[PDB]
């Protein structure tokens, strides 16, 4: 049972660096997401 | 009852009662209650078309 | 834009007394923890 | 930063309770020392 | 019964939780649990980096 | 949790919110929607001719 | 002048943060310090 505790220990401290990563993954999508509304943007006054 | 405290559940508690604060706490200063970030998908999807 | 609001734009006037709870929860949660730590010592302290 | 956060900073809402109870496991030991020392001086007192 | 005594578990116990004790200590008053020292190396590696 | 907090999702938006009073403050002040600067440069180029 | 004020200006949005931070390690060590320079003394005093 301890070695099952420090199992599930070293368990979360993986599953928060997992989340810490993908929330850089996040953020990085988040800035994309705002790149291409303003791609978009750029577009449509690109008529002209 | 001297090897451990079975106390922790409250530190179970404060940190979940923590993660919601900072997640109240960024909603309140960025003010959108669904985040900019991965929080209700489907109203992410929504809010960004 | 109105359809974003409802979306989007936090009710806060619940927000701000979650948060208020939230931190409610801090203050106690650490009070809580402050105060059982310090059964161990008493219980030996007695006990011995 | 929050992933160093994450994988740096002490949830010390443990380590506070590990530093009472070690503390409690430190008073213990010298009291239990100062009771044991004694037994030697009290059985060569007595049987002699 | 008296050339020695057998309570060094005891001693041994003192021992390692004062050890115990001053890694915790070094914890509280540094702010990180995984130290400065040579704990967790693969921590260290993704700290440092 | 005392070495750092995760509340500077505040600051980045009080950052984010200062750079658009700054821009919003100066487009009042020279009464042009877009400003003399990069703004818009289709719109710039626009103005221009 | 606002590159001047980039470059040295200080962004204490941050700031105030990393004081507070530095105000609570700082009563975190006095308490630290407090509480360890006990140590000798009861042990001695219970051992002896």
Request: hydrophobic residues 40%.
């Amino acid at each position: 049972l301890s070695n099952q505790i420090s199992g599930l220990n070293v368990a979360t401290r993986n599953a928060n660096d997992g989340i810490s990563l993908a929330q850089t993954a996040e953020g990085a999508l988040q800035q994309s997401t705002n790149i291409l509304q303003r791609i978009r943007d750029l577009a449509l006054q690109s008529a002209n | 009852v001297n090897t451990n405290i079975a106390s922790l559940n409250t530190q179970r508690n404060l940190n979940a009662s923590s993660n919601d604060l900072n997640t109240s706490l960024q909603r309140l200063t960025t003010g959108y209650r669904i985040n900019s970030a991965k929080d209700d998908a489907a109203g992410l999807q929504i809010s960004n078309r | 834009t109105n359809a974003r609001s409802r979306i989007k734009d936090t009710d806060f006037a619940a927000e701000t007394a979650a948060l208020s709870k939230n931190q409610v929860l801090q203050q106690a949660g650490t009070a809580i923890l402050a105060q059982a730590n310090q059964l161990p010592q008493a219980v030996l302290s007695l006990l011995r």
